[PDB]
Chain A
Amino acid sequence: DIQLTQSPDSLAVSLGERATINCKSSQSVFSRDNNKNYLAWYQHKSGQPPKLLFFWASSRESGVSDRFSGSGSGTDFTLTIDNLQAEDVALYYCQHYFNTPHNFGQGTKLEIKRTVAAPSVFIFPPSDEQLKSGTASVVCLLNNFYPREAKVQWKVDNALQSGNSQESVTEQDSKDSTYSLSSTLTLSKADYEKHKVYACEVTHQGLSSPVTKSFNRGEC
């Protein structure tokens, strides 16, 4: 049983620069009989099936960008991406097929570095439909920011909230290399109607001061 180990586990590389991902095999996967390394590289983008990049360690699958190249032999292998593009953001895997099982490496997460971009902030009161059901969700959207570290705080009539919100961040965008974040404050209809001002307060390194988006409940 041959195992693969990749280095680094995660890598953040600037647009236009070179990305280097290494694969170390626990035993040689080089055959002196065939003069070939029994290794492949795959790309796995968010929401897509994995895609074959190289086989025999260095032979390029048709339709794969000439910016990509596979090298190495024996036990040490490298995937090189030159002139890094936004769409290269992905998980990358090596795999051997020397014997069974045809194990994959554990994966390397390639992240893209781009210029700082502050979030655009939007807020959504609860719909009248949902209010009819007896609950109220207030949604705050932080759109297209970089880097990923962004903070959201909820204030209701200027009082800081705790314990009644959840948030989720997107994967990194394949076109503009940003992130987006959604935060939801959830209350009973009864509690919601006990207050007037609902505010989302946003901190990010692209902002010199916190940005607040708010509405007054009932103001059309």
Chain B
Amino acid sequence: QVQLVESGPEMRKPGESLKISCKTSGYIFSDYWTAWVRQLPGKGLQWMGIIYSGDSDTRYHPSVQGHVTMSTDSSLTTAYLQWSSLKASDTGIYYCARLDARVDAGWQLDSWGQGTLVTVSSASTKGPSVFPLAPSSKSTSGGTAALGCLVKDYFPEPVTVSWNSGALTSGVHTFPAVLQSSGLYSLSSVVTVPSSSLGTQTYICNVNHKPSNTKVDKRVEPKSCH
């Protein structure tokens, strides 16, 4: 069906070039524009502009003109956003979204990409260390056990956490990362489960940090005494 799929997260140094992509499928590319939208810190969306693949006709927001460039590959039904010389303040989430080009149509954005976190920093990329938060009598009460993973010392954002390859979602809390004094991020992901089934169920946190090409699966087992 109708889909817009963006590149994974990207990490670059200031001054470097970058082109992110938005692969569209499920609809006729030539019947639509493609818009790029930037998410602002805290709250807010900035309409950056649009591009029609038919003749590469472009509108830009007057305050993004000339710093970013939109293009398309109609053959690949894909739209691009490009910086020739990144600045650290370009960091943030960028969405693509489709817009009806037809006569008749309003120019609302009815389908959206998942967003791409672009980070621009002179600091070094670093993959996380992943440590178990083991269920024990100190995290078990009322029939409920809490367990989780500590994801420590990574850069940049984002780190992705799933549990049991996505089969475990209810009761999961993956906390917003904190910025340590070291300039590295840390977060935790926790889940509450029945304490009765700790002996029969298996809990694995799957940790992904694409900027460092790091993937960690950590089995989280109940604490025992040795």
A residues contacting B by CB (< 8 A) are: 1, 36, 38, 40, 42, 44, 49-52, 55-56, 61, 91, 93, 95, 97, 100-104, 106-107, 109, 120, 122-127, 129-130, 133, 137, 139, 141, 143, 166-171, 180, 182, 184, 213-215, 220
Check A182–B106 contact: CB distance below 8 A.
no
Check B138–A168 contact: CB distance below 8 A.
no
Cβ contacts B110-148/A at 8 Å (1 or 0 each): 111111000000000000010111101011111010101
Q: A120-B144, A130-B131, A215-B138 are in contact. Are A95 and B150 (CB under 8 A)?
A: no
Listed A/B pairs (23) with beta-carbon separation below 8 Å: A38-B106, A40-B109, A50-B37, A50-B95, A61-B110, A102-B107, A104-B37, A104-B44, A106-B44, A120-B141, A120-B144, A127-B150, A130-B129, A133-B129, A139-B148, A139-B150, A141-B190, A168-B187, A180-B175, A182-B175, A182-B190, A184-B178, A220-B225
**Cβ of A103: which chain B residues have Cβ within 8 Å of it?**
47
Check B107–A101 contact: CB distance below 8 A.
no
Nearest CB to that of A100 among chain B residues?
Answer: B59
A-B contact count (CB 8 A): 143
| Dominant secondary structure of chain B at its interface with chain A | strand
Check A93–B115 contact: CB distance below 8 A.
no
- Is B192 at the interface (CB under 8 A from chain A)? yes
Check B108–A127 contact: CB distance below 8 A.
no
Check B106–A56 contact: CB distance below 8 A.
yes
Q: A120-B141, A122-B146, A168-B178 are in contact. Are A104 and B108 (CB under 8 A)?
A: no
Please tell me the number of chain B residues within 8 Å of chain A, measured between CB atoms.
Answer: 56
Check B192–A143 contact: CB distance below 8 A.
yes
Q: A97-B106, A170-B176, A220-B226 are in contact. Are A123 and B139 (CB under 8 A)?
A: yes
Most-contacted residue by chain A among B43, B177, B226 (CB, 10 A): B43
Report the minimal beta-carbon distance from B56 to chain A, rounded to whole angstroms.
Answer: 16
- Interface residue from A49, A100, A213 paired with B95 (Cβ < 8 Å): A49
Nearest CB to that of B176 among chain A residues?
Answer: A168
Nearest CB to that of B218 among chain A residues?
Answer: A129
- Interface residue from B35, B61, B109, B131 paired with A127 (Cβ < 8 Å): B131
**Cβ of B132: which chain A residues have Cβ within 8 Å of it?**
127, 129
Report the minimal beta-carbon distance from A1 to chain B, rounded to whole angstroms.
Answer: 7
- Is B211 at the interface (CB under 8 A from chain A)? no
Check A166–B192 contact: CB distance below 8 A.
no
- Is B173 at the interface (CB under 8 A from chain A)? yes
Check A102–B47 contact: CB distance below 8 A.
yes
